[PDB]
Amino acid sequence: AAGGWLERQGIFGLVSDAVNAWREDGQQSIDGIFDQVESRFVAAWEDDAGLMTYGE
Amino acid sequence: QHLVQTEVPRKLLEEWLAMWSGHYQLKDKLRVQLRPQRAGSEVLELGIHGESDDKL
Known part of the structure; x- marks a missing residue:
């Protein structure tokens, strides 16, 4: 179910791109690459979930 | 962010x-009413009303 969501939202696309770039660049530290994808994921999840207080 | 509802x-x-x-090519501006x-009552009525407020 989570995979379905990541696919639809383009996050799995970002992951594929990230891994390909990592491989092409000689498999150096994934720290920065991972951080960037994680940031996009968090933004996308927050947006789609409709995150707000109960009051809101 | 807005709720589906x-x-x-x-x-x-x-x-x-x-x-x-x-x-x-009708002139009458049609208004929508949705009320109990x-x-x-939990029974609702969707009404289409003309400029004269007649229920069409």
Whole structure:
């Protein structure tokens, strides 16, 4: 179910791109690459979930 | 962010009915009413009203 969501939202696309770039660049530290994808994921999840207080 | 339950206003049907009235070259501006069919009822009435407030 989570995979379905990541696919639809383009996050799995970002992951594929990230891994390909990592491989092409000689498999150096994934720290920065991972951080960037994680940031996009968090933004996308927050947006789609409709995150707000109960009051809101 | 908005809830799914707030994404569909009465005005949307009014816009469609304006498109409709436009095609059929009718003059009467059609208004949409959605209220309990009587006071305190869980039964609802969707009414289409003309400029004279007649139920069409």
